[PDB]
Short mmCIF file of C-alpha atoms and ligand atoms in Angstrom, two decimals:
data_model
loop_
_atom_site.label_atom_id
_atom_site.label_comp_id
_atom_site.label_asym_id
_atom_site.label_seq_id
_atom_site.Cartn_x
_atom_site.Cartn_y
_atom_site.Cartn_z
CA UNK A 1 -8.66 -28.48 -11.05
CA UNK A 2 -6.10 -30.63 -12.13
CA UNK A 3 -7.03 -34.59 -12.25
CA UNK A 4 -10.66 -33.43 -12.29
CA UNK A 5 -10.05 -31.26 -15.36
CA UNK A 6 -8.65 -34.69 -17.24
CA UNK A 7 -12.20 -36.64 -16.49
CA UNK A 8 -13.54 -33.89 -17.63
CA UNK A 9 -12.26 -34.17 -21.14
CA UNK A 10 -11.70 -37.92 -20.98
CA UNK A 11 -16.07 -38.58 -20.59
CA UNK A 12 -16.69 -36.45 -23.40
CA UNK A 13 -13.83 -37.29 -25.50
CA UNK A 14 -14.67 -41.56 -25.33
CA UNK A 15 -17.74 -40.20 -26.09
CA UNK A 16 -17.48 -38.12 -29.15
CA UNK A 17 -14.43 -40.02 -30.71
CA UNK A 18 -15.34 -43.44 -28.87
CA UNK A 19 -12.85 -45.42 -27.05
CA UNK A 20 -9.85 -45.80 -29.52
CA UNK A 21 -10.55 -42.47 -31.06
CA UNK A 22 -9.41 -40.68 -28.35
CA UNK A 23 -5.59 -41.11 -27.03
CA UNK A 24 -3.52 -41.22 -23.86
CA UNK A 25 -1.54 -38.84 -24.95
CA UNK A 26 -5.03 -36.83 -26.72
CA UNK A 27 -6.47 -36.28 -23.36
CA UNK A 28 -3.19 -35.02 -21.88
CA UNK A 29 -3.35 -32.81 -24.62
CA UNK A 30 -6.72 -30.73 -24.62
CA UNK A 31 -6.58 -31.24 -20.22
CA UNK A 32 -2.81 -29.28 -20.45
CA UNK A 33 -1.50 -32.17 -17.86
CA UNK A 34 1.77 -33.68 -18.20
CA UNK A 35 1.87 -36.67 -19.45
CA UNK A 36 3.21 -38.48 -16.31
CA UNK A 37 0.90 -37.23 -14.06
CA UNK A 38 -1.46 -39.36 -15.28
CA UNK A 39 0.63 -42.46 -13.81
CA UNK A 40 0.10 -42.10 -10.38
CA UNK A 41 -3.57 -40.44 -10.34
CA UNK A 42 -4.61 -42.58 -13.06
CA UNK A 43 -2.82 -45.85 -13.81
CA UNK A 44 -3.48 -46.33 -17.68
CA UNK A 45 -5.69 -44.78 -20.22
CA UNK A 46 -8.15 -48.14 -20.07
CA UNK A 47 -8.16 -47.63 -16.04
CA UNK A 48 -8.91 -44.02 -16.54
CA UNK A 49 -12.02 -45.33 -18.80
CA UNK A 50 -13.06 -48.14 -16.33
CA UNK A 51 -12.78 -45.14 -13.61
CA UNK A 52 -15.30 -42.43 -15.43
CA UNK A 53 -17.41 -45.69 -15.69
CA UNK A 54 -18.04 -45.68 -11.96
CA UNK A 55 -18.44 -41.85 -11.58
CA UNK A 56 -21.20 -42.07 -14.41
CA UNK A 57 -22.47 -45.28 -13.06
CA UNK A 58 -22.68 -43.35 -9.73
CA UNK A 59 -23.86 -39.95 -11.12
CA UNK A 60 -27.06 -41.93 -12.70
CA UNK A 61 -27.69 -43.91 -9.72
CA UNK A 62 -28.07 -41.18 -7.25
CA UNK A 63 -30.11 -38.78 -10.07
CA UNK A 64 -32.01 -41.59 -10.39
CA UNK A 65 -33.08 -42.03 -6.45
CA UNK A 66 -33.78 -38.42 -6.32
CA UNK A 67 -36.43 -38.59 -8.99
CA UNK A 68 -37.82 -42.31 -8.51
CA UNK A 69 -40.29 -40.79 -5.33
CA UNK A 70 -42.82 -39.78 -8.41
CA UNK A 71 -43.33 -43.32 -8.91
CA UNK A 72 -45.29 -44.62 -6.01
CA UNK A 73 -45.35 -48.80 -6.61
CA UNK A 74 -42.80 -50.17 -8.00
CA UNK A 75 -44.61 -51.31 -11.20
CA UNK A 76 -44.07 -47.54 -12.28
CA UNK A 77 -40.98 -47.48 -10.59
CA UNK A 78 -39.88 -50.05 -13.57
CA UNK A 79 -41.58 -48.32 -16.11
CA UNK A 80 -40.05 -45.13 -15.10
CA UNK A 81 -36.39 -46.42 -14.47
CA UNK A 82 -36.52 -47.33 -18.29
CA UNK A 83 -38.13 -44.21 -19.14
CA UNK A 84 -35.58 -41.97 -17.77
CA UNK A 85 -32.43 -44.10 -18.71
CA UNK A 86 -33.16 -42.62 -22.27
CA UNK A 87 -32.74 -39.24 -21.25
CA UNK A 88 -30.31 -39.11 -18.52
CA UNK A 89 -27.04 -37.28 -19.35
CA UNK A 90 -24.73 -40.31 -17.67
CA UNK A 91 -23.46 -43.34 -18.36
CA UNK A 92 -26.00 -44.73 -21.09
CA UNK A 93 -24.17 -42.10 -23.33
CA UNK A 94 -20.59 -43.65 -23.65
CA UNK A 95 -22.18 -46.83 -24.26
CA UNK A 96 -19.88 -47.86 -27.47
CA UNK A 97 -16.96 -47.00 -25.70
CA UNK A 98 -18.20 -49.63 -23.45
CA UNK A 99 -18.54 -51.94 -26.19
CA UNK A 100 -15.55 -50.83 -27.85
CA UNK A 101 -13.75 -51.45 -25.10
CA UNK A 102 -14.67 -54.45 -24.12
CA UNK A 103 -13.97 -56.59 -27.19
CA UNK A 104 -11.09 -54.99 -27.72
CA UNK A 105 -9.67 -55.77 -23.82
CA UNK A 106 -11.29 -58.80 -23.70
CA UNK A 107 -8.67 -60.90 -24.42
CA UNK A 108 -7.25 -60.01 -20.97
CA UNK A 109 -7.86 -60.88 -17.14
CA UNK A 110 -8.01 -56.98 -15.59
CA UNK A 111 -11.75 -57.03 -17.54
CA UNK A 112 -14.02 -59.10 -16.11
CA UNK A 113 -11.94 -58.67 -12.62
CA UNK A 114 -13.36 -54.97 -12.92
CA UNK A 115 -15.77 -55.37 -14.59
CA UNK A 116 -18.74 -57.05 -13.28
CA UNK A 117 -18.10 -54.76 -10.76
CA UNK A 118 -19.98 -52.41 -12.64
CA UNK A 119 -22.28 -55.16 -14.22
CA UNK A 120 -24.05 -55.76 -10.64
CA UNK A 121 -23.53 -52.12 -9.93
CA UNK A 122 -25.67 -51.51 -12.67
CA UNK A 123 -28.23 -54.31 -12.80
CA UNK A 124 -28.64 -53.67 -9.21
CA UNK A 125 -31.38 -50.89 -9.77
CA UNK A 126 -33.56 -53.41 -11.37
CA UNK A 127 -32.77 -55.90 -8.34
CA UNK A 128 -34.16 -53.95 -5.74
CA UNK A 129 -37.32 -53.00 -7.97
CA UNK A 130 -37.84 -56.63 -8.08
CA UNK A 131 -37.29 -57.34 -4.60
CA UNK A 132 -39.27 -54.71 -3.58
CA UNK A 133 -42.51 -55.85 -5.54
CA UNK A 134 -42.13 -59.04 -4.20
CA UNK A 135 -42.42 -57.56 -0.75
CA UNK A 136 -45.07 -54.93 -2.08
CA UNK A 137 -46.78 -58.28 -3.66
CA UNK A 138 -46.67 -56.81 -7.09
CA UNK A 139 -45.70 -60.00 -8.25
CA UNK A 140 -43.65 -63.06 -7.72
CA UNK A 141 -40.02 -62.87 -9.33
CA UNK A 142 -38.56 -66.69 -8.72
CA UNK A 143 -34.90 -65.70 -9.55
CA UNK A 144 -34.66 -62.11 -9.41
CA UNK A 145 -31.00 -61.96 -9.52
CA UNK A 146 -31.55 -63.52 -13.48
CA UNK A 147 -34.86 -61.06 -14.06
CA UNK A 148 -32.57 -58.25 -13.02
CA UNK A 149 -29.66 -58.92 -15.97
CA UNK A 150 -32.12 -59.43 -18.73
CA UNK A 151 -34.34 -56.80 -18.54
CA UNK A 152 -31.26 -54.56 -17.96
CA UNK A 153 -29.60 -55.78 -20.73
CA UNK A 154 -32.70 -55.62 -23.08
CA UNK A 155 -33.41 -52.15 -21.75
CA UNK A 156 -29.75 -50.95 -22.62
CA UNK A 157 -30.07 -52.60 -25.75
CA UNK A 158 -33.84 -50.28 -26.86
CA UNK A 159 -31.59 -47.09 -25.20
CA UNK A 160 -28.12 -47.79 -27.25
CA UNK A 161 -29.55 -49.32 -30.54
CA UNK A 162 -32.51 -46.46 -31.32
CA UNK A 163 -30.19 -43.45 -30.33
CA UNK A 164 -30.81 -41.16 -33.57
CA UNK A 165 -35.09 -41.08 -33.84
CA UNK A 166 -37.56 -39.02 -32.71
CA UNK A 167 -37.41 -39.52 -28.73
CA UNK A 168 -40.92 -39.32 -28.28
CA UNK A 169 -40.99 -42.60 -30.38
CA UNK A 170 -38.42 -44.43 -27.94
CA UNK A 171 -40.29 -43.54 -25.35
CA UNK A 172 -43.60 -45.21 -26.84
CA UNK A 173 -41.43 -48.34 -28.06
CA UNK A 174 -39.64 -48.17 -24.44
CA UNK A 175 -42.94 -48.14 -22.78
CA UNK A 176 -44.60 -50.66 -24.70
CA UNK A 177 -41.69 -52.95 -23.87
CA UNK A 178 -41.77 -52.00 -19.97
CA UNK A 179 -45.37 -52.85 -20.07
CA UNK A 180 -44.89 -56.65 -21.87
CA UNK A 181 -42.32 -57.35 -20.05
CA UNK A 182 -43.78 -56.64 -16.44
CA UNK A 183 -46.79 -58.73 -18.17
CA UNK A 184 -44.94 -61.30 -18.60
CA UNK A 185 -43.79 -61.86 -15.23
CA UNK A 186 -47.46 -62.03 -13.47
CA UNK B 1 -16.50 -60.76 -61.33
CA UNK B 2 -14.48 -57.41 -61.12
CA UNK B 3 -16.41 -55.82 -59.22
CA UNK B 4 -16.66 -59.43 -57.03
CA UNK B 5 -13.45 -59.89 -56.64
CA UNK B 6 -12.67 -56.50 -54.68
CA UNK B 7 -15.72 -57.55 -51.99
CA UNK B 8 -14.14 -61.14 -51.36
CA UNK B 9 -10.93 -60.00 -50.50
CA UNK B 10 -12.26 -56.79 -48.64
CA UNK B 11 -14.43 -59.42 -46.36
CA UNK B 12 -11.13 -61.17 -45.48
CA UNK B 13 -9.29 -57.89 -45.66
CA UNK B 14 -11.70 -56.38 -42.93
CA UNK B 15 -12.07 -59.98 -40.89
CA UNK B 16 -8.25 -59.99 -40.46
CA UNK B 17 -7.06 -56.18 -39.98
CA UNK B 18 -10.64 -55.11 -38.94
CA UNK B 19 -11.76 -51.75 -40.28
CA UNK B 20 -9.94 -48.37 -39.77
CA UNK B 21 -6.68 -50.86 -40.33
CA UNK B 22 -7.67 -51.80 -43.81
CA UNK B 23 -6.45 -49.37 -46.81
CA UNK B 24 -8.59 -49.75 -50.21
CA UNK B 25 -4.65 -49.40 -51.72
CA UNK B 26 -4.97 -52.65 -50.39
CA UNK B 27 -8.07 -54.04 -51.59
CA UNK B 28 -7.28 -53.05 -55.06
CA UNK B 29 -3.91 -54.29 -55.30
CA UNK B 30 -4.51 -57.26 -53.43
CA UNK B 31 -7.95 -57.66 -56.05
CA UNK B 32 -6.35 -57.21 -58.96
CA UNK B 33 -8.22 -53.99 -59.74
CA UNK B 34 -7.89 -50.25 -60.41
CA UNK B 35 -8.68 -47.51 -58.09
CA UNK B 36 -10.99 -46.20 -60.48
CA UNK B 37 -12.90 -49.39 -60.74
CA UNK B 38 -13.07 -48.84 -57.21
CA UNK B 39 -14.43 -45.74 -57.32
CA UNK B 40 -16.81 -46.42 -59.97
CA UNK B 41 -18.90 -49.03 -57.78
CA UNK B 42 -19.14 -48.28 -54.50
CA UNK B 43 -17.13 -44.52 -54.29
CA UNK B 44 -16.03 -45.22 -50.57
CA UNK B 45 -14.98 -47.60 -48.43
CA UNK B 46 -17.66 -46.90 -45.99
CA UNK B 47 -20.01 -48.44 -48.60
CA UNK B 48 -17.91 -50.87 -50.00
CA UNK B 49 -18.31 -51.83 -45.86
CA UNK B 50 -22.14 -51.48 -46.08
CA UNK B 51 -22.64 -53.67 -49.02
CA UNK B 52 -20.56 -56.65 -47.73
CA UNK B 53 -22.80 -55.94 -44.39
CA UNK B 54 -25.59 -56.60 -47.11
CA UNK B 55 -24.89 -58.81 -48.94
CA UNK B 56 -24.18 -60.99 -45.58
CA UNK B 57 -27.13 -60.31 -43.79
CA UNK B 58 -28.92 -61.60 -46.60
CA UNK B 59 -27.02 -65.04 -46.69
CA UNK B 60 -28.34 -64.93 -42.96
CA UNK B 61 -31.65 -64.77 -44.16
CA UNK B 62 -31.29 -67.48 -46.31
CA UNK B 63 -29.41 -69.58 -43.87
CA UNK B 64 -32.46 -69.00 -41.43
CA UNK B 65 -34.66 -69.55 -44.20
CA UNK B 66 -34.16 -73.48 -44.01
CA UNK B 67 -33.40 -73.57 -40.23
CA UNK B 68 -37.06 -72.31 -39.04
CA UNK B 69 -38.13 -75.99 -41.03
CA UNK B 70 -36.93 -77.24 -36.91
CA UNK B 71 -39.25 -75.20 -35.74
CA UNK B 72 -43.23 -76.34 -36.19
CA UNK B 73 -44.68 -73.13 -34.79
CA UNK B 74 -44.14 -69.66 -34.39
CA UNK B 75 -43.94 -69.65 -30.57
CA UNK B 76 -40.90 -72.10 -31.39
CA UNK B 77 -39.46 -69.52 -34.04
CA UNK B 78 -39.46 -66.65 -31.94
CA UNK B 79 -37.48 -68.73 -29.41
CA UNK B 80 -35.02 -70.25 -32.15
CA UNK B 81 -34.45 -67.39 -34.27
CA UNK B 82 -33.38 -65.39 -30.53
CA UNK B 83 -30.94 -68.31 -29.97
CA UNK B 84 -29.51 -68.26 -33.63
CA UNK B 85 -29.08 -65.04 -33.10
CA UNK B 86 -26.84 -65.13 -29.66
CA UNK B 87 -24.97 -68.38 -30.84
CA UNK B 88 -23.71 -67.37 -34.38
CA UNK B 89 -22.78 -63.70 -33.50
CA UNK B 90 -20.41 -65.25 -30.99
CA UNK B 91 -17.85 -67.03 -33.72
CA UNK B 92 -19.04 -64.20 -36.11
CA UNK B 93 -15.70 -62.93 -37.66
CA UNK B 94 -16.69 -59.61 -39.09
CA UNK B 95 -18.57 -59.05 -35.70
CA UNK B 96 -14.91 -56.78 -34.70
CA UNK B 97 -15.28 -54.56 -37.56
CA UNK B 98 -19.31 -54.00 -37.58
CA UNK B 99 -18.75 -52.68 -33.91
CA UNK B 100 -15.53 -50.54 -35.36
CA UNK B 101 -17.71 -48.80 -37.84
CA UNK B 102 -20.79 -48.31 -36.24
CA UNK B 103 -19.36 -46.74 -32.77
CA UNK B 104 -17.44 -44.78 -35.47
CA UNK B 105 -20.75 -43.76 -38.19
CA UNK B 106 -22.76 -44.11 -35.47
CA UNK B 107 -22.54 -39.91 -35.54
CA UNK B 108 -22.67 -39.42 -39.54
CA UNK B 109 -25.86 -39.25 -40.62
CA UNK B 110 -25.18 -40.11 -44.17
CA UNK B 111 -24.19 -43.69 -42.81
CA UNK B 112 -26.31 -43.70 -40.14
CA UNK B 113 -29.39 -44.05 -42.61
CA UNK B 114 -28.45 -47.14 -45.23
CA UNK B 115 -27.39 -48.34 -41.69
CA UNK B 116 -31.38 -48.62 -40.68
CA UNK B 117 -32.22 -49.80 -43.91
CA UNK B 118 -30.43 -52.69 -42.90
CA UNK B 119 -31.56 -53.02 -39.07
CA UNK B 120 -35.14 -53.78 -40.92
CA UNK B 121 -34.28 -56.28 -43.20
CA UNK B 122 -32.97 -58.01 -39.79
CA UNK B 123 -36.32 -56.95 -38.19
CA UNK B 124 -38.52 -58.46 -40.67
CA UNK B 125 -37.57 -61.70 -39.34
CA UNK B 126 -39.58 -60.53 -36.18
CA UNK B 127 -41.89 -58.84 -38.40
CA UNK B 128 -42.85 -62.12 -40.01
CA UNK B 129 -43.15 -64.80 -36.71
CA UNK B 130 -45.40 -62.00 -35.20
CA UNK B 131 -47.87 -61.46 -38.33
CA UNK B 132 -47.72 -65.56 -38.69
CA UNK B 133 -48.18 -65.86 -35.26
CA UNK B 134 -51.48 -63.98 -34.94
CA UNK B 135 -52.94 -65.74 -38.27
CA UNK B 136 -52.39 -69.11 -36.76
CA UNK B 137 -53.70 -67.70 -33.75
CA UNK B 138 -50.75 -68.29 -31.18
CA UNK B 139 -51.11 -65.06 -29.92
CA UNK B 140 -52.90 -61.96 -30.95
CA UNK B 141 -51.02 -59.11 -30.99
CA UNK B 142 -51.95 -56.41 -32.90
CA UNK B 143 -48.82 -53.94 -33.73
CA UNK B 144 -46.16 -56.17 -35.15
CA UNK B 145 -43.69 -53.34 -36.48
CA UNK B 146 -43.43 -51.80 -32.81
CA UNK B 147 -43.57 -55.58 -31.02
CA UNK B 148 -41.29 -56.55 -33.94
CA UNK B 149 -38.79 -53.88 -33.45
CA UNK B 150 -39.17 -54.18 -29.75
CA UNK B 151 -38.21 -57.72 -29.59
CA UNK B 152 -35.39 -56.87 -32.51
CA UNK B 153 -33.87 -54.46 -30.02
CA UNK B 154 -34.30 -56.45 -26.62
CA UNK B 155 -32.59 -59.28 -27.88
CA UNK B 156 -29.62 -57.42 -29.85
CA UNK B 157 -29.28 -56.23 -26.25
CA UNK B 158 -29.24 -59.39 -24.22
CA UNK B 159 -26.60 -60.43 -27.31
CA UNK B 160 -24.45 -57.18 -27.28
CA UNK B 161 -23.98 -56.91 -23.35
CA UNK B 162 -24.51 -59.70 -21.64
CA UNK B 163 -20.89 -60.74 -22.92
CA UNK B 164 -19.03 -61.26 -19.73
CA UNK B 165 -21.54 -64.71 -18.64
CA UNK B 166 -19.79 -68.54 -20.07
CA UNK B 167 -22.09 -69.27 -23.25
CA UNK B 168 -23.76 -72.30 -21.87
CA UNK B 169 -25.52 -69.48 -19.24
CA UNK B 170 -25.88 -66.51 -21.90
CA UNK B 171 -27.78 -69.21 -23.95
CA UNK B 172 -29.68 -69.76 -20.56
CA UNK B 173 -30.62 -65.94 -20.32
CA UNK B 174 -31.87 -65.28 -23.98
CA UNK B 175 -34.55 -68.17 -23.75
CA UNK B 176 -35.77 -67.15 -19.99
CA UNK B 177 -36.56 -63.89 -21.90
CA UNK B 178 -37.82 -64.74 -24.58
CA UNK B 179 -40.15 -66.66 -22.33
CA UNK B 180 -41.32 -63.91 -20.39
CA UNK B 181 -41.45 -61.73 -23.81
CA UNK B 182 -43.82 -63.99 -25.55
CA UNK B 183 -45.80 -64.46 -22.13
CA UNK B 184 -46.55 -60.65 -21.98
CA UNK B 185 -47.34 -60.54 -25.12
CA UNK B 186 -50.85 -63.15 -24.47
C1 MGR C 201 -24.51 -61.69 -37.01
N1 MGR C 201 -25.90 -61.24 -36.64
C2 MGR C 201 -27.01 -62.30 -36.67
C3 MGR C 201 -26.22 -59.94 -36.28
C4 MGR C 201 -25.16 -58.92 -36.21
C5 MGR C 201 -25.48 -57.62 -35.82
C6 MGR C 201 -26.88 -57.16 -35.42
C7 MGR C 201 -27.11 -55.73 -34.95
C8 MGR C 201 -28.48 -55.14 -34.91
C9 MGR C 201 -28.97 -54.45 -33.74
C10 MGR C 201 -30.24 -53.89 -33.70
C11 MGR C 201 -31.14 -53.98 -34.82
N2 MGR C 201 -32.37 -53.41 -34.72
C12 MGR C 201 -33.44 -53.98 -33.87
C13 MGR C 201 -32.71 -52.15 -35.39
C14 MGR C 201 -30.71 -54.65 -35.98
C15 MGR C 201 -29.43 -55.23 -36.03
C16 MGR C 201 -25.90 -54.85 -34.43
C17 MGR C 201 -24.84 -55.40 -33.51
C18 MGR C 201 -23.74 -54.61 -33.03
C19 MGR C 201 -23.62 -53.23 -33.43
C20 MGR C 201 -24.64 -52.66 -34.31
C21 MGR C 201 -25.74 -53.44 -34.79
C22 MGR C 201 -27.94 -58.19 -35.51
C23 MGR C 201 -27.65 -59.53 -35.91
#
């Protein structure tokens, strides 16, 4: 395909090369697309970026829903959200790009007006684990709007900050957490 | 003083320009040096980099070495050295250029490994409160390097992407966590 050969090259080149690393112009190089029709299909290169956002925010989300059934009460559904988010092939990967790219576009208004988009798109899966044990009576979560940002952005920071040891370690260390954390809450 | 010189004017160099943008044909000429002093200290610029990251860090230690005198206990500490932590990284001015190198040596592996060297001598900190902590008998937790790198990593989380909130609520987050962190932990 055409504009689903340029995604294609434009994940895995943020990734590699990280957000400024890779071009505009780069992408319409190793995809063979002409440079305009980006344009149309895509507006600019940082709307191209905040669009594979939602595909791998998506990918994840549904990957994650088909595999979730193993964990019967929520309580492991937690546990094993954070497990898998270290070895999922989506979105956690192009996490520097993220980072990247947003102190280096955050000195502009299309940001956080797209952008928390994905924030509650994201620390939604921890919202509805909450919820849920609430209803389950697995515990009593006050605010778990609040409970759902922190532990999401603590978990993304054990995934993004430890990525280059032995992954049978971050999976202790994320389990560990998973387990004070929930403690914490009872 | 030499070999001083070239690391003051690199710290501005890099705080202004950030880091792929600054030249070392610039911090010699604008330090008064040779190239081949240069080269004869740190070899690279990628080091000249990591030592100002050292040498800085360990001013923080110091600078949080008589600001834990506010703080009685070491419940307190662990709650005040989390908040130092999110309020100075905010004005931070080489913050730009950490993010620029790592989510650029993330990758190399040469880098990548002075690069941990330094993530301890920031996890100590944890390290420390913990091991206090149990002697004094606040808590009793019993493996302080994983808990210590644990909390290290949760809260350079909440820091790193929980950007987008107004500070007055981001400091709000960091001490509901570290809350329910130290509550798990008894
Ligand atoms: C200005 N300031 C107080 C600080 C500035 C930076 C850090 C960091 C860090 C993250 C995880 C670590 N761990 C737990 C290995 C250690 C350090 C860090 C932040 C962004 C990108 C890479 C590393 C911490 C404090």
């Amino acid at each position: 395909n055409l504009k689903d050969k340029i995604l294609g090259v434009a994940k895995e080149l943020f990734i590699k090369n990280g957000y400024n690393a890779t071009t505009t112009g780069e992408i319409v190089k190793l995809s063979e697309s002409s440079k305009g029709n980006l344009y149309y299909h895509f507006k600019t290169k940082e709307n191209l970026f905040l669009e594979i956002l939602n595909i791998e925010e998506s990918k994840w989300q549904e990957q994650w829903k088909k595999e979730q059934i193993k964990a019967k009460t929520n309580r492991e559904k937690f546990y094993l959200y954070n497990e898998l988010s270290l070895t999922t092939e989506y979105y956690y990967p192009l996490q520097n790009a993220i980072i990247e790219f947003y102190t280096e576009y955050y000195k502009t208004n299309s940001i956080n007006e797209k952008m928390n988009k994905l924030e509650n798109k994201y620390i939604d899966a921890y919202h509805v684990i909450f919820k849920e044990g609430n209803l389950n009576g697995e515990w009593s979560i006050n605010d778990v709007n609040a409970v759902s940002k922190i532990a999401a952005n603590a978990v993304n920071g054990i995934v993004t900050f430890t990525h280059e040891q032995n992954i049978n370690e971050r999976i202790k260390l994320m389990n560990k957490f998973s387990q004070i954390f929930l403690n914490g809450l009872s």
